[PDB]
Amino acid sequence: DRTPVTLIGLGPMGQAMTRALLAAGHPVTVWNRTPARAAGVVADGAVLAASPVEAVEAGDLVILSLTDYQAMYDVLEPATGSLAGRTVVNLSSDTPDRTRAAADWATEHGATFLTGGVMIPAPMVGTEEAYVYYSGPAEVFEKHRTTLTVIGAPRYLGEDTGLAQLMYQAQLDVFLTTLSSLMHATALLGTAGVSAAESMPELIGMLRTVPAMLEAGGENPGADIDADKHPGDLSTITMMGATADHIVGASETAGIDLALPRAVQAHYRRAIENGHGGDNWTRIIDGIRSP
Amino acid sequence: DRTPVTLIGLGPMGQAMTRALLAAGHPVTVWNRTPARAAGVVADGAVLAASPVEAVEAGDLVILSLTDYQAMYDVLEPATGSLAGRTVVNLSSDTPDRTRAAADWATEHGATFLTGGVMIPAPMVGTEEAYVYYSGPAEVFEKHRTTLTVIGAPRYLGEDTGLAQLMYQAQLDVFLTTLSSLMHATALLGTAGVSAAESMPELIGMLRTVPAMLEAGGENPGADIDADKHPGDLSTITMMGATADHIVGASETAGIDLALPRAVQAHYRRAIENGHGGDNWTRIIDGIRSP
Ligand SMILES: NC(=O)c1ccc[n+]([C@@H]2O[C@H](COP(=O)([O-])OP(=O)(O)OC[C@H]3O[C@@H](n4cnc5c(N)ncnc54)[C@H](OP(=O)(O)O)[C@@H]3O)[C@@H](O)[C@H]2O)c1
Ligand SMILES: NC(=O)c1ccc[n+]([C@@H]2O[C@H](COP(=O)([O-])OP(=O)(O)OC[C@H]3O[C@@H](n4cnc5c(N)ncnc54)[C@H](OP(=O)(O)O)[C@@H]3O)[C@@H](O)[C@H]2O)c1
Ligand SMILES: COc1cccc2c1CCC(=O)C2
Ligand SMILES: COc1cccc2c1CCC(=O)C2
């Protein structure tokens, strides 16, 4: 395929995605707030447009890899007159509702809009491990599918432009919270003079087992949550809530951040106050859904 | 080995541990606040002691599998006169300083004390996947190591009775916080009518890759944290903090718990306020260590 592409935003992700698209035989025209940053991808065959307008006018497909959606408006507002007849593919983090309004902004300027959420770090872009969530108009996705697939295995979720964003934010909810918990635990262990080089392999070793620890003895958390079925015979909210209390207590004594473990503690407390101490830990979702 | 064992506390863990010890040829005498709960392990060859005193006097080794350390005091207070010359192995969650004081309480009553933290759910007890952290007097550990290994591969951390507890609390810090994040994300996706049966495999599928997504592009977090090395070339705190902001925003709009994502958000905010927006995410540990 030789569809000409425009890519705006040359952080690590933009640079890797440009390279992937070049390697697959696409002309790529790039633009960046900091043009010096384009030197690498220019050496690989990208063309540096001088202006956002020139960049947009060089592609059927305009991909954004920016910190947030405000950046999309910042860069494209001077170029709105050149959007008509093109597809904007925004591969940036923001809220679902910002995303939906941006889709409408695109339409108003005569363009189509696809939402994407890239689910791997830069070095994995364009590899068999890469995958990207997409939502928006099916015909628009299908038109550009072969081009986009170069970045990573596409997972089209449906018509709502906000849905791929919601999925990205949910994934990153788990990812960033997990990472914070690793740093929290590493700090906790640090207060007895355990180094991060010692603690992090222990912690990561445990994290590796989590899918299997969740499956043990025939538990199947998702379908169980859907059924309002939370049997506590292998672990109760009382018992795991006690541990959340112990983590808070240990954290208080350690002089470290209390907000993360207290949020977890609060999940258990709500379930107990609502009379479900005997239930499995999945019951915490009720109080999370309705605070 | 046929060392006689006493095990107090017959939740799922106590029952599984009793079974494992029986299968390895140990006499096990059990006691429980709710004796009816012992029926299963009695059918498998355990002897139900009538009283805590009788239970303690039947074993060289007294294992506790109780919700917290207060329970240990509740059950053993009437039996304190029978502790002398025995080893108490507490496999219960509590704070490190509660644990240390408990060790001294044991010594005062003429017993030795070992701290243990069991790192797998009940169905994995006694399997090749099982492991348990231990701390306390090395000679006491070495004496009972043969018996204890039946429950799971022992990981002795040193002399401080509080250290295996600190490690358990740190592990459960990661585990419970991760679980809370899964339910948080599942709730978030629920607000667009995505079922938990759909969302949880996606989220778990991402979590599966975390031990490897952190290694992409040659990152080695632990040693790097020890070296105060936080290069931001593949991901910055500014960019990941923006995503934390987006999760909070999405969560606010979704009507779900804000405390968990705001805790994570605050980790990023502190790093930026302290002038490290350009750094890798690991830098959040500084603000966690010193709130
Ligand atoms: N890094 C990852 O591992 C990863 C993984 C998947 C998804 N993502 C997402 O991918 C996107 C790109 O992230 P990244 O890590 O590659 O880079 P980043 O640090 O977010 O920077 C991306 C680009 O945004 C530009 N930018 C930011 N604010 C701007 C504004 N107001 N006006 C114009 N340009 C602006 C930067 O300009 P300058 O070059 O001039 O600074 C840069 O070119 C983000 O939305 C991120 O959440 C990242
Ligand atoms: N479940 C897991 O997957 C898991 C994995 C690793 C570690 N752990 C840890 O292992 C320990 C046991 O957990 P579990 O899930 O098997 O059981 P649990 O729900 O914590 O109950 C364990 C035992 O504690 C007893 N108990 C609680 N408070 C008591 C008190 N004040 N006086 C006397 N007995 C008291 C219960 O008595 P009754 O039988 O009369 O109610 C029961 O026998 C906990 O510390 C937990 O954190 C659990
Ligand atoms: C979806 O993957 C990411 C999103 C935001 C930041 C990061 C990633 C993956 C790799 C990493 O550690 C940094
Ligand atoms: C150390 O493993 C646990 C501690 C407390 C609760 C649970 C576990 C692991 C298995 C599970 O789903 C529930």
Domains and CATH numbers, chain B: 5-159 (3.40.50.720), 166-289 (1.10.1040.10)
Among A182, A184, A267, beta carbon nearest to B180: A267
Q: Is B231 on the interface with A (CB under 8 A)?
A: no
Structure tokens at A253: 């004594």
Using an 8 Å CB-CB cutoff, list chain A residues near B261. Answer: 173, 177
Nearest atom within ligand 1 for CA of residue A37: 39
List the strands of the sheet with B131-135, edge to edge.
B47-48, B28-31, B5-8, B61-64, B87-90, B112-118, B131-135, B153-156
Residues 6+ positions from A238 with CB-CB distance below 8 Å: A272, A277, A278, B67
SS (H, E, C) B221-256: HHHHHHCCCCCCCCCCHHHHHHHHHHHHHHHHHHCC
Phi, psi of A5 (to 5 degrees): -115, 150
Query: How distant, in Å, are the alpha carbons of A67, A91, B121 from that of A48?
Result: 20, 20, 56
- Angle among Cα A124, A127, A129 to the nearest 5 degrees reads 75
List the strands of the sheet with A5-8, edge to edge.
A47-48, A28-31, A5-8, A61-64, A87-90, A112-118, A131-135, A153-156
Strand partners, A113: A88
Residues 6+ positions from B27 with CB-CB distance below 8 Å: B2, B4, B5, B47, B58
Helix (H, G, I), strand (E, B) or coil at A65: coil
- Chain A 5-44, residues with CB within 8 Å of chain B CB atoms: 11-12
Q: Is A100 on the interface with B (CB under 8 A)?
A: no
Q: In whole angstroms, give the CA distance from residue B150 to residue B153.
A: 8
Q: In whole angstroms, give the CA distance from residue A50 to residue A274.
A: 61
Q: In whole angstroms, give the CA distance from residue B271 to residue B273.
A: 6
Chain B: give the shortest CA distance to residue A60, in Å: 28
Dihedral angle, C-alpha B257, B263, B264, B268, nearest 10 °: 140
Strands B112-118 and B131-135: antiparallel
Phi, psi of B46 (to 5 degrees): -70, 155
Cβ–Cβ < 8 Å for B112, B135? no
Helix (H, G, I), strand (E, B) or coil at B54: helix
Structure tokens at B206: 């991402």
Among A123, A173, A239, beta carbon nearest to B181: A173
Are residues B186 and A285, on separate chains, in Cβ contact within 8 Å? Answer: yes
Question: Is the backbone of residue A93 left (phi > 0), alpha (psi -120 to 50) or beta?
Answer: beta
Strands A112-118 and A131-135: antiparallel
In chain A, the residue whose alpha carbon lies closest to the alpha carbon of B266 is A259
Q: To which residue do tokens 């992700």 refer?
A: A13
Question: Is the backbone of residue B3 left (phi > 0), alpha (psi -120 to 50) or beta?
Answer: beta
Q: To which residue do tokens 């947009």 refer?
A: A56
Give the closest residue to B68 by CA, choosing from B9, B136, B149: B9
Q: Which amino acid is at B44?
A: D
Q: How was this structure determined?
A: X-ray
Centre of ligand 3 to C-alpha A249, Å, is 31
Q: In whole angstroms, give the CA distance from residue B238 to residue B280.
A: 9
